[PDB]
């Protein structure tokens, strides 16, 4: 077994935070000292070989904007120990009591962090396939991180999916860029569902005819332009995450030097 393997008695599961058919998620303590998130896998749901393959991936990706794997109990029942993201999902963060205080400088810094995590995914030649606010985790001091997208995919959203991926199964880093554009609308609306009022079938129909969401209220046109680059019909014309990270990092000097705070953004 690996240097990642830990004894079962070194973990305390203190608070249950989430529940699905896959298993559960807990806040707990590791070795009596370390605050951790503990994801359990229900026995019998997944092939040990498949878990072994995904575990290898998890132990190879280290990035400050990717939630860090800490340890594993890799025999059934399986436990997965990661750094604890104390605010939960970005979706819940934006919808909850904090959303009303967030302004455009905070939201764009959050987007820059997520781009930085996806930039790393990009240069490691991986694909997320479900980039959206429900799958981003938030910690203290507005830190945002990309979660365990590989394990998520194995365990398993038309409105976040690029058309070539939704129709033809063409999932690439360029379809993650499209999703990142949708996530920009989540940030600027404080977590509203995209394409408000439209059902999935009409979203798909319209987007093929060239429909794109309009500029959200109080969002600068230059940020809506960036969204529209992410939603280019040709995937190869969409920008890289490396470009998205640099544009968002530099935004309030290079792009909107005259930004003034408003009622909501
Ligand atoms: F497996 C792996 C493997 C490698 C990297 C990352 C992971 C997943 N590591 C997590 N996974 C999950 S999934 C949980 N869902 C369900 C409920 O709310 C949305 C998220 N949550 C996590 C973590 C790490 N910290 N947290 C916080 C959860 C939370 C919820 C509510 C309040 C405070 C904190």
The candidate with the shortest Cα–Cα distance to 59, out of 47, 49, 68, is: 68
What contacts 166, CB < 8 A, 6 or more positions away?
Answer: 158, 204
Q: Strand pairing partners for 16?
A: 26
Dihedral sign (CA 18, 126, 70, 35): negative
The closest residue, in CA terms, to atom 32 on ligand 1 is 88
Q: Which of 130, 148, 176, 234 is catalytic?
A: 130
Q: What's the angle, vertex CA 89, arms to CA 87 and CA 91, rounded to 5?
A: 120
Q: Is 193 annotated as a binding residue?
A: no
| 139 in contact with ligand 1, CB cutoff 6 A | no
The closest residue, in CA terms, to atom 2 on ligand 1 is 148
At residue 238, what are phi and psi to the nearest 5 degrees? -65, 155
| 18 in contact with ligand 1, CB cutoff 6 A | yes
* Cα gap 8→18, rounded to integer Å: 20
- Token pair 């790393």 is found at 120
Q: How many residues does the chain have?
A: 265
Residue numbers of the domain that contains 117:
88-255
Hey, which of 60, 74, 88 would you mutate to test ligand 1's pocket, going by the most ligand atoms within 8 Å of its Cβ? 88
Annotation says 130 is catalytic: yes
Residue 95, classified by CB atoms within 10 Å of its CB into exposed (0-12), middle (13-18) or buried (19+), is middle
DSSP sequence for the chain:
--TTB--GGGEEEEEEEEE-SSEEEEEEEETTTEEEEEEEE-TTSS-HHHHHHHHHHHHH---TTBPPEEEEE-SSSEEEEE---TT-BHHHHHHSTTGGG--HHHHHHHHHHHHHHHHHHHHTT---S--SGGGEEE-GGG-EEE--HHHHHHH--GGGS-HHHHHH----HHHHHHHHHHHHHHHHTTSPPSSTT--HHHHHHHHHTT----PPTT--HHHHHHHHHHT-SSGGGSPPHHHHHHHHHTHHHHT-TT----S--
Q: Which atom of ligand 1 is nearest to the CA of 68?
A: 5
| 65 in contact with ligand 1, CB cutoff 6 A | no
Hey, which of 13, 17, 152 would you mutate to test ligand 1's pocket, going by the most ligand atoms within 8 Å of its Cβ? 17
Q: Is 19 annotated as a binding residue?
A: yes
CB 132 within 8 A of CB 209: no
Q: Which atom of ligand 1 is nearest to the CA of 39?
A: 1
Output the domain CATH number for residue 146: 1.10.510.10
């Amino acid at each position: 077994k690996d240097a990642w393997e830990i004894p079962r008695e070194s973990l305390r599961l203190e608070v249950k935070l989430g529940q699905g058919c896959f298993g559960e998620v807990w806040m707990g303590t590791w070795n009596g000292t370390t605050r951790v998130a503990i994801k359990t896998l229900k026995p019998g749901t997944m092939s040990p070989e498949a878990f072994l393959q995904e575990a290898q991936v998890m132990k190879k990706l280290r990035h400050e904007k990717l939630v860090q794997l800490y340890a594993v109990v890799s025999e059934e029942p399986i436990y997965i120990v990661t750094e604890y993201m104390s605010k939960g999902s970005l979706l819940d963060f934006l919808k909850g009591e904090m959303g009303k205080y967030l302004r455009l400088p905070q939201l764009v810094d959050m987007a820059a962090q997520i781009a930085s995590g996806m930039a790393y995914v990009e240069r490691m030649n991986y694909v997320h396939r479900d980039l959206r606010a429900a799958n981003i985790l938030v910690g203290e001091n507005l830190v945002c991180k990309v979660a365990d997208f590989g394990l998520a995919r194995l365990i398993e959203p038309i409105k976040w999916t690029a058309p070539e991926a939704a129709l033809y199964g063409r999932f690439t880093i360029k379809s993650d860029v499209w999703s990142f554009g949708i996530l920009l609308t989540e940030l600027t609306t404080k977590g509203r569902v995209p394409y408000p009022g439209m059902v999935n079938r009409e979203v798909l129909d319209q987007v093929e005819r060239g429909y794109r969401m309009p500029c959200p209220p109080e969002c600068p046109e230059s940020l809506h332009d960036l969204m529209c680059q992410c939603w280019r019909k040709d995937p190869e014309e969409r920008p890289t995450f490396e470009y998205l990270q640099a544009f968002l990092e530099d935004y309030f000097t290079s792009t909107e030097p005259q930004y003034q705070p408003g009622e909501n953004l």
